[PDB]
């Protein structure tokens, strides 16, 4: 049961595959749920599952 | 002076990732094949008009220009921010200033911050108390007009400040840039595989 | 009105065939409080009944 | 990702009128919170400051 | 439109608009239906042609 | 459910709640009347067979 900045949910989180953009914060889906984040004090791109 | 806006006017409209998918979203663009004027650097500093965001580019490699200039009325009577390149940091401070008819670097503070063969594209535009700073340096070959091609300008700079913006100048130096605005339009954007914007399309165009 | 109605008795005088000017009514302040319902006040000076 | 603290003083019958959206003379010509507000306010009695 | 500010206009107006578009949703599926069944008949008579 | 108490955060949620069940009763719909289409489709095809 995760929690970045304030926004709460649950779901398993892995390494990101992703290449992220450097003032961004969270990739969004069709469904408008969160679906990759970047840590909050650390600079790890994470898949959120 | 007129030149033709390709398709260069467009941006990331927000910090939120999204990849191989087209997203409708709308924002304040600068809008596609129109006309952006074209002004040249001689030796004057003409008067520009902010409105609603501005569009901004300058082919060079030799730092002709050495910062910006924003504010409501130039007399150090108003709270005026102001943009100069040092050559180690592209300072934004927001003070009381004192200008003149030709005000330039060459050969009541409320705050600090520190940092032709190329475009070095900008944009600038201020909305709800934030000034946000978007920019890109990419390569060319040709020097009149910008090219027909795609680019993306990215942001480097979220300010938030908080003043009035609706007239703005620019810095020369003794030792050919571009100007157009931006304005309301529904855009599609196609992030790709990377993540990265690579085309969009005008909603209200034809 | 120098003297007023009892709530035992009270008054009902009625308004027709003038122009009205609520705005001067409204902008001058010696009110503790000025509601309106199912209208709302800045809106009267538009309206024609 | 940021917070501004909007300080001021004012009578007590008007802040009945500082709410975000409702009309008055205070929230239309001095100072204005918009319909879509998110935040809070507070107010303190002040008889000795 | 003529008689409020947003923040009860809205609500008036949203009132409306759940059974404006309600009704607009029961002519479509009434529509869609009626229209299989018309497809029945054309289907029948292009067969007996 | 991350910036609300209940008495409230059950309003924002009921306004959601009409309106995706609102959706998804679209969506039933929808594919029914598809299915009997594509039924009266696979009885043709099943005559043909
Ligand atoms: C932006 O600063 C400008 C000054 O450039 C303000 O514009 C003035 O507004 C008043 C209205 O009371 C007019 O009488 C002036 O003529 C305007 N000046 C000019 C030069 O057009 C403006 O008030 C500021 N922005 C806002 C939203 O208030
Ligand atoms: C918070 O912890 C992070 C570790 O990633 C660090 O970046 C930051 O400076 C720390 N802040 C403190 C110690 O307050
Ligand atoms: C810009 O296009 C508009 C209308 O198409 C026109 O007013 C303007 O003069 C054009 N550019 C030039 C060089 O004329
Ligand atoms: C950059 O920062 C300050 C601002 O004027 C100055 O002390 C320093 O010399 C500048 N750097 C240069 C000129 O390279
Ligand atoms: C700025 O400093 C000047 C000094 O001339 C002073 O008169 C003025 O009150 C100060 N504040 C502003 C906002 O101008
Ligand atoms: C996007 O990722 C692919 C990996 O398959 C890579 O080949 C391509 O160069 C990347 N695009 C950019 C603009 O770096």
């Not at chain 2, 900008?122 to 090219?147: A, C, M, Q, W």
């Not at chain 2, 908080?162 to 196609?190: D, E, M, W």
């Not at chain 3, 809106?43 to 024609?48: E, V």
């Not at chain 4, 003083?9 to 009128?17: A, L, N, T």
Request: net charge neutral.
């Amino acid at each position: 049961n995760f929690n970045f900045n304030g926004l709460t949910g649950t779901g398993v989180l892995t390494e990101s595959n992703k290449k992220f953009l450097p003032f961004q914060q969270f990739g969004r889906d069709i469904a408008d749920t969160t679906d990759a984040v970047r840590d909050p004090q650390t600079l790890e791109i994470l898949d959120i599952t | 002076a007129y030149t033709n806006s390709f398709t260069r006017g467009v941006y990331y409209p927000d910090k939120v990732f999204r990849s191989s998918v087209l997203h409708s979203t709308q924002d304040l663009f600068l809008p596609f094949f129109s006309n952006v004027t074209w002004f040249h650097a001689i030796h004057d500093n003409p008067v520009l008009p902010f409105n609603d965001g501005v569009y901004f580019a300058s082919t060079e490699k030799s730092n002709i220009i050495r910062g910006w200039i924003f504010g409501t009325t130039l007399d150090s009577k108003t709270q005026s921010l102001l943009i100069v390149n040092n050559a180690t940091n592209v300072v934004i401070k927001v003070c009381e200033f004192q200008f003149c008819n030709d005000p330039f670097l060459g050969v009541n503070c409320t705050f600090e911050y520190v940092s032709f063969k190329n475009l070095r594209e900008f944009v600038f535009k201020n909305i709800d108390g934030y000034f946000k700073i978007y920019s890109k340096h990419t390569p060319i070959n040709l020097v009149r007009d910008l090219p027909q091609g795609f680019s993306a300008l990215e942001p480097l700079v979220d300010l938030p400040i908080g003043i009035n913006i609706t007239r703005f100048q620019t810095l020369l130096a003794l030792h050919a840039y571009y100007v157009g605005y931006l304005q309301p339009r529904t855009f599609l954007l196609k992030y790709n595989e990377n993540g990265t914007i690579t085309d969009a399309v005008d909603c209200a165009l034809d | 009105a120098t003297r007023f109605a009892s709530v035992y008795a009270w008054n009902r005088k009625r308004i027709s065939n003038c122009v009205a000017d609520y705005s001067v009514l409204y902008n001058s302040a010696s009110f503790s409080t000025f509601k309106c319902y199912g209208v709302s006040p800045t809106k009267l000076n538009d309206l024609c009944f | 990702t940021n917070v501004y603290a909007d300080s001021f003083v004012i009578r007590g019958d008007e802040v009945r009128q500082i709410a975000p959206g409702q009309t008055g003379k205070i929230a239309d010509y001095n100072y204005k919170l918009p319909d879509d507000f998110t935040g809070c306010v507070i107010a303190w009695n002040s008889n000795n400051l | 439109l003529s008689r409020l500010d947003k923040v009860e206009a809205e609500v008036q107006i949203d009132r409306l608009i759940t059974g404006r578009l309600q009704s607009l949703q029961t002519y479509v599926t009434q529509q869609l239906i009626r229209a299989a069944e018309i497809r029945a008949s054309a289907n029948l008579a292009a067969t007996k042609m």
